[PDB]
Write a protein that binds this ligand. Structure first.
Ligand SMILES: CN[C@@H]1[C@@H](O)[C@@H](O[C@@H]2[C@@H](O)[C@H](O[C@H]3O[C@H]([C@@H](C)O)[C@@H](O)[C@H](O)[C@H]3N)[C@@H](N)C[C@H]2N)OC[C@]1(C)O
Ligand SMILES: [Mg+2]
Ligand SMILES: [Mg+2]
Ligand SMILES: [Mg+2]
Ligand SMILES: [Mg+2]
Ligand SMILES: [Mg+2]
Ligand SMILES: [Mg+2]
Ligand SMILES: [Mg+2]
Ligand SMILES: [Mg+2]
Ligand SMILES: [Mg+2]
Ligand SMILES: [Mg+2]
Ligand SMILES: [Mg+2]
Ligand SMILES: [Mg+2]
Ligand SMILES: [Mg+2]
Ligand SMILES: [Mg+2]
Ligand SMILES: [Mg+2]
Ligand SMILES: [Mg+2]
Ligand SMILES: [Mg+2]
Ligand SMILES: [Mg+2]
Ligand SMILES: [Mg+2]
Ligand SMILES: [Mg+2]
Ligand SMILES: [Mg+2]
Ligand SMILES: [Mg+2]
Ligand SMILES: [Mg+2]
Ligand SMILES: [Mg+2]
Ligand SMILES: [Mg+2]
Ligand SMILES: [Mg+2]
Ligand SMILES: [Mg+2]
Ligand SMILES: [Mg+2]
Lengths: 145, 206, 54, 141, 63, 70, 143, 67, 56, 105
RNA sequence: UAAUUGCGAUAACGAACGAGACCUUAACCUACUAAAUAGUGGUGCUAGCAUUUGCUGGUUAUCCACUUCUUAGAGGGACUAUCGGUUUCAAGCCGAUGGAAGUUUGAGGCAAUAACAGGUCUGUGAUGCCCUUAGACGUUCUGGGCCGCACGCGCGCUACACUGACGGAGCCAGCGAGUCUAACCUUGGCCGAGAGGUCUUGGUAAUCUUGUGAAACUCCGUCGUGCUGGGGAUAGAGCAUUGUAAUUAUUGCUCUUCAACGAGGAAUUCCUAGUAAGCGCAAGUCAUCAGCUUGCGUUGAUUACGUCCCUGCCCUUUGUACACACC
């Protein structure tokens, strides 16, 4: 596209969402080392934050970085479809959430604990550490825990 | 060359070489000779061809394999290792690429440069597994001319492919380095090394 | 199910920590195929009844 | 009624029909001029029959071809066989014979089969494996 | 280094337990009019031109 | 992450002054200069075609080829 | 001389025409564009972001021009491709309809395509105008 | 490999024996000859017979053959 | 009616079989050797070929 | 007598019995001087069935493939009502399936 | 020689089953008879470019002509022919030219005598005997089970990437199969991110779906060697489809989660040309479900044209106290 020049303005390894982000990679695959952000959801927020993707995670003005985050925690406000979202129809408040980062593990547990606290068979299956999706256990998964 | 047109036009450089010289993608099949005695009649080079594809039936009779155009043999061995079987369009595209690299370094019709890397990489004599009683010893044997070309081809390719695996450099690039280094043998090429070690174990056990 | 999760002595850890028995690895080995041409009827037949029939 | 001959060429399942009539030297395949064709590495395989007999040669004739069957490459071998074939057919029935035989001589000497249909045809898969020769696999015990 | 070039004048037979060797009589080219029987590796027909690394030596049997 | 992901004006200047003498440049040859990765190595293949230096004699994605100007 | 679009290689055509509808600004890009994929059998959305609607419509027009009439259904099978089932073998899949349909409904309201009899869509005569026009332009850059 | 079954070489033997006049060194005429003079159940089989009687005829001219 | 040509022809050979069977079971003591069915306008004709027809 | 524009369809599994009746219809009509699209042969469809030979699962896996060959022919005539009802009540064959329709649709 | 296929040797001569022959299927027929259910050229009707003409489409009959290409009847063609090598001076074999084709032309179907305690009473309203037969081992219904998971083994599917992934864009097959008491194949039109939904429609089918616009593949870019944008197991949440019934999650779809795997030890399978290998498709199963099978075509190589070393088997001879025949 072009050779660029800049200055010491770009800083590698900026940290957001309590996680750390390699600079010197293209900005979309940067935002995805966080938990809850895969290639798609990265790709949509960047386009939604009005950001040049040809840029690496490096240049990326600090103000650009606060819109990226704002959109991430509030996807439905900046119009992300809510089928795009990992967590919909909550099972308590029935709002639609994109749960992010260090919280992803938390919501995961609570889900599991529900099945468990409820006596759900699917719960019993997690609690014994076995395969939940039904698959044949006789053969596969012998390296195991 | 006296151009001519008609309803649908055939372009400038297209027309030009075309009717005139029978040469390659564009590369001269004139000159380009086989630096080694023997090895002729087993290195093809006249008849000239345009691109490396053919419908050629070389597989129906024992030695017709030799008559197959030499470069095409090379691009033939290019397409293999599992995933890359079939895919001659792939491998032919690489051949046009490597020859464009070969000529880039040291001029030298790249067709000639491979003729050399193929002639220098045939091992003259090899060893076989003979019982020799009990524990098998190895009788040294002088390898046939055809075989010398076969192995030459496979060795270079296998090397380039092995070499191009898992590094930024491209198949067409590594095909060229090996080809050049084996053209006048540097023993920095995977083929030259292994042509010399088949002939070294051939001198010891004789 | 309330009994199912309240049961220790269950699950993957407790299976992981047990030794696998021998009878698993071992072949079925067939048997008896030595004896195949030897009839276990213990009866056989008679040249009379083979000529009355055939 | 203009002078017109019609030929074909085959490779595997690809057949290509070539109309060779008296014209101004257009050469087009299906809907498109001979100058696209796009496998594009093989572009010269379709150029080949022209530049073998000399580029001129075509200006008293119009050349149309349409192809069906086979794959991207199979078709490329059929139109070149159907372009070469049609040229000899024209000079057969219109121009003299010693000229036609100097066209076949100029092909068959070079060949690649331009005048002669390659008879290679798929083999039947037979039970016990995925391919025609290649059998499944066995473990013994 | 003494390269010696040799043209196959006759096909003899296949030797070795495997049978992947061919016995051959050659006439080496510069100063012909002397005959040697060598052993080949790959396939050989008449008139093939062989490179003997060592001029004088020859074999007979193979197992 | 190993190095050479951005610009470093010295490396810009390195490039102009270091790419004569290259009988072949490509995306490989530009990383083999202990330098930029394939993203901006391509970019430089464009911007070296901006004026002077690299003469394309080859085409497309993957294999690229150039020689020094004359 | 005369020109049709079959005189111009596929891509430089559909590119110059995409850039042409880009310049144009008569489009109707549905706005779910860029938040979408273009196949159920695809990993990522398209890499042209702003754009790629003009890429596909350009192609669509080119396809329809060639043959009699083509529905939304045909477009799906065409524009579809291999879907990775992951650990399971690859199966071919139809691309997303809403993409190619609203590509038709946009090329209609641009008068470059019309509903055909027999079903499908057919190249508008004002389309063969415009198409065989920019197809002339493209060998005019190559002069 | 290409070998003539007994029923082929026994017919040819039976032919050249009685019909040696006519029956020349050209397969083609010999082919049609078979049709008039003999009744053979298949095109393939007949031509096999003919084409061999041709070989036998062809080297008879170079001196007799056993059988 | 209105069946595919295919299914029809396979349905005809299914019929012959079932009839062939029925007659082999019924007429065995009469020496039934086989059947053929000719379909005509207005009728369908069944020909039993059997070695004792008078008990038929 | 009025010229009715007829289409007859011959379909059978027995070629000799089919081409007998077809060529029979072709000469009986055209000696008798009418307007004919002669036998127009339709691709013979081979209906195939692939089975294991063994009734159970033992033994190497031997597949067998039966087939039934359906040849179809159609003949277009234009005649009056009298030679249609005569030619079509006779020429009857076992195994050949004759169909006579009056119309294009 | 593929062959107890033949030549030849000859107390044997002359023959039969089996091999061959034969049958089916694939390759070739400017000639046979034809085709709006296959297409071609012409002519109208007509669109668009540009052109004094010419190019590309459109058009179920608007007519006229034709059978190269597609279809299938009946014929024809190869017999290893011609020539040259090579040998008992033999059947054959190698080479060449020609040819659609010269590996039994390619590929199969059929298949002598005998053998086995091979498999199958879980295909059968095939069957002897035994068992059971009213608190049934008959049968139906409800619900689970055949999927159950420390692990051992076999057939496979997907991968370890730069001969690549991803995004555009290019765009090509062949074998198939489809619905009346019925819901089959489904073009098209709109709704939908998708999955799918919905109003219509053509097709009992060379007529409609269908050129099944398959996939690998080709091109232009983005990634750039980093367990990475290779890889997608695992798992969460949601939305759809089949079915009475989806929990132990039939299948499908979107976000998220992002493992092992950096080329696999001892071993061991398959394979010689349009083959191996890559790739998808249809058919069978079938309500739904293909990582499976049976066929199909697309891309399309390396290397043998040998030997008896291994292994397996056939054939002579040899020994035997075996003949219920080394179990
Ligand atoms: C999308 N829902 C389904 C879709 O999954 C699909 O299902 C078919 C299924 O019905 C077919 O069922 C089959 O049943 C008939 C019948 C005579 O046995 C067969 O002739 C034929 O193979 C097929 N139609 C099956 N073979 C393929 C699936 N794709 O197509 C039918 C459907 C209703 O649209
Ligand atoms: Mg993440
Ligand atoms: Mg590499
Ligand atoms: Mg597609
Ligand atoms: Mg695609
Ligand atoms: Mg995958
Ligand atoms: Mg017999
Ligand atoms: Mg017209
Ligand atoms: Mg014809
Ligand atoms: Mg001879
Ligand atoms: Mg038993
Ligand atoms: Mg039974
Ligand atoms: Mg019983
Ligand atoms: Mg029973
Ligand atoms: Mg059972
Ligand atoms: Mg049982
Ligand atoms: Mg059953
Ligand atoms: Mg029975
Ligand atoms: Mg086991
Ligand atoms: Mg098996
Ligand atoms: Mg791609
Ligand atoms: Mg059709
Ligand atoms: Mg088709
Ligand atoms: Mg990763
Ligand atoms: Mg991945
Ligand atoms: Mg199931
Ligand atoms: Mg199965
Ligand atoms: Mg031998
Ligand atoms: Mg013993």
């Amino acid at each position: 596209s072009l050779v660029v020049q800049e200055q010491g303005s770009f800083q590698h390894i900026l940290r957001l969402l309590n996680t750390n982000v390699d600079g010197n990679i293209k900005i979309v695959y940067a935002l995805t080392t966080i938990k809850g952000v895969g290639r798609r959801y990265s790709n949509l927020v960047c386009k939604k934050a009005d950001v040049d993707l040809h840029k690496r995670a490096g240049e990326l003005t600090q103000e650009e970085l606060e819109r990226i985050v704002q959109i991430m925690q509030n996807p439905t406000h900046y119009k992300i479809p809510a089928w795009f979202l990992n967590r919909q129809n909550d099972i308590t408040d029935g709002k639609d959430y994109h749960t992010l980062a260090n919280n992803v593990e938390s919501k995961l547990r609570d889900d599991l604990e529900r099945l468990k606290k409820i006596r759900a068979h699917r719960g019993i299956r997690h609690f014994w550490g076995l395969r939940v999706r039904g698959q044949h256990t006789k053969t596969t998964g012998r390296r195991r825990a | 060359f006296t151009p001519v047109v008609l309803a649908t036009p055939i372009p400038e450089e297209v027309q030009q070489a075309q009717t005139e010289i029978k040469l390659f993608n564009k590369w001269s099949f004139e000159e380009v000779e086989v630096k080694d005695a023997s090895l002729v009649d087993y290195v093809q080079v006249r008849q000239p061809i345009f691109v490396a594809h053919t419908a050629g039936r070389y597989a129906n009779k024992r030695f017709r394999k030799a008559q197959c155009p030499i470069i095409e043999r090379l691009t033939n061995s290019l397409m293999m290792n599992g995933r890359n079987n079939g895919k001659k369009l792939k491998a032919v595209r690489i051949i046009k690429h490597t020859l464009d690299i070969i000529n880039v370094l040291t001029d030298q019709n790249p067709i000639q440069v491979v003729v050399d890397a193929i002639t220098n990489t045939g091992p003259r004599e090899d060893t076989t597994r003979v019982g020799g009683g009990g524990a098998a010893r190895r009788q040294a044997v002088d390898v046939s001319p055809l075989r010398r070309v076969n192995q030459a081809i496979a060795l270079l390719t296998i090397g380039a492919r092995e070499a191009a695996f898992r590094n930024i450099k491209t198949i067409a690039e590594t095909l060229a380095e090996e080809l050049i280094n084996a053209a006048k043998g540097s023993s920095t090429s995977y083929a030259i090394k292994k042509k010399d070690e088949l002939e070294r174990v051939a001198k010891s056990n004789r | 199910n309330e009994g199912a999760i309240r049961d220790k002595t269950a699950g993957r850890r407790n299976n992981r920590s047990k030794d696998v028995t021998d009878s698993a690895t071992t072949k079925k080995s067939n048997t008896r195929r030595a004896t195949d041409r030897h009839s276990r009827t213990g009866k056989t037949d008679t040249k009379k009844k083979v000529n009355q029939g055939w | 009624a203009v002078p017109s001959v019609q030929t074909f060429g085959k490779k595997k399942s690809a057949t290509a029909v070539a109309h060779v009539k008296a014209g101004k030297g257009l050469i087009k395949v299906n809907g498109s001029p001979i100058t696209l064709v796009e496998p594009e590495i093989l572009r010269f395989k379709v150029y080949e029959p022209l530049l073998l007999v000399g580029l001129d040669k075509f200006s008293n004739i119009d050349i149309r071809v349409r192809v069906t069957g086979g794959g991207h490459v199979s078709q490329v071998y059929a139109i070149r066989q159907a372009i070469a074939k049609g040229l000899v057919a024209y000079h057969q029935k219109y121009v003299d014979e010693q000229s036609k035989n100097e066209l076949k001589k100029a092909f068959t000497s070079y060949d690649r089969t331009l005048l002669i249909a390659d008879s290679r045809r798929p083999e039947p898969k037979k039970f016990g494996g995925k391919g025609a020769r290649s059998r499944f696999q066995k473990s013994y015990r | 280094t003494p390269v010696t070039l040799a043209k196959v004048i006759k096909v003899l037979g296949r030797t070795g337990s495997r049978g992947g060797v061919t016995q051959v009589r050659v006439e080496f080219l510069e100063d012909t009019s002397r005959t040697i029987v060598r052993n080949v590796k790959g396939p050989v027909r008449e008139n093939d031109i062989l490179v003997l690394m060592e001029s004088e030596r020859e074999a007979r049997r193979l197992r | 992450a190993q190095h050479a992901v951005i610009l470093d004006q010295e490396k810009y200047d390195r490039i102009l002054k270091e790419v004569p003498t290259y009988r072949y440049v490509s995306v490989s040859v530009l990383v083999d200069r202990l330098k930029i990765g394939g993203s901006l190595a391509r970019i430089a293949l464009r911007h070296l075609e901006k004026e002077g230096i690299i003469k394309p004699i080859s085409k497309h994605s993957k294999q690229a080829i150039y020689t020094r100007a004359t | 001389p005369g020109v049709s679009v079959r005189d111009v290689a596929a891509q430089d055509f559909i590119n110059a025409y995409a850039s042409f509808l880009q310049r144009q600004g008569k489009l109707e890009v549905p706005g779910y564009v860029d938040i979408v994929k273009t196949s159920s059998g695809n990993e990522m959305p398209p890499q042209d972001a702003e754009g790629w609607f003009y890429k596909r419509a350009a192609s669509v027009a080119r396809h329809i021009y060639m043959r009699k009439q083509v529905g939304v259904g045909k477009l799906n099978k065409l524009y579809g491709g291999a879907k990775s089932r992951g650990v399971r073998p690859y199966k071919h899949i139809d691309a997303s309809g809403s993409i190619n349909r609203k590509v038709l409904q946009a090329l209609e309201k641009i008068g470059i395509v019309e509903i055909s009899p027999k079903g499908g869509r057919r190249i508008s005569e004002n389309g063969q105008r415009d198409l065989d026009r920019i197809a002339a332009q493209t060998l005019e850059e190559d002069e | 490999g290409r070998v003539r079954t007994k029923t082929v070489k026994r017919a040819s033997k039976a032919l050249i024996e009685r019909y040696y006049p006519k029956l020349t060194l050209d397969f083609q005429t010999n082919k049609r000859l078979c049709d008039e003079i003999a009744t053979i159940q298949s095109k393939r089989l007949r031509n096999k017979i003919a084409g061999y009687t041709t070989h036998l005829m062809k080297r008879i001219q170079k001196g007799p053959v056993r059988g | 009616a209105l069946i595919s040509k295919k299914r029809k022809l396979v349905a005809d050979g299914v019929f012959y079989a079932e009839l062939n069977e029925f007659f082999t079971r019924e007429l065995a003591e009469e020496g039934y050797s086989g059947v053929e069915v000719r379909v005509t306008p207005t009728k369908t004709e069944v020909i039993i070929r059997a070695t004792r027809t008078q008990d038929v | 007598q009025q010229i009715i524009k007829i289409r007859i369809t011959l379909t059978s599994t027995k070629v000799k019995q089919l081409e007998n009746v077809s060529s029979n219809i072709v000469k009986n009509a055209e000696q008798h001087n009418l307007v004919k699209k002669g036998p127009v042969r339709l691709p013979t469809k081979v209906l195939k069935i692939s089975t294991r030979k063994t009734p159970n699962g033992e033994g190497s896996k031997t597949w067998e493939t039966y087939e039934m060959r359906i040849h179809k022919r159609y003949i277009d005539l234009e005649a009056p009502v009298q030679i249609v009802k005569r030619i079509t009540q006779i020429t009857i064959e076992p195994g050949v399936d004759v169909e006579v329709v009056v119309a294009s649709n």
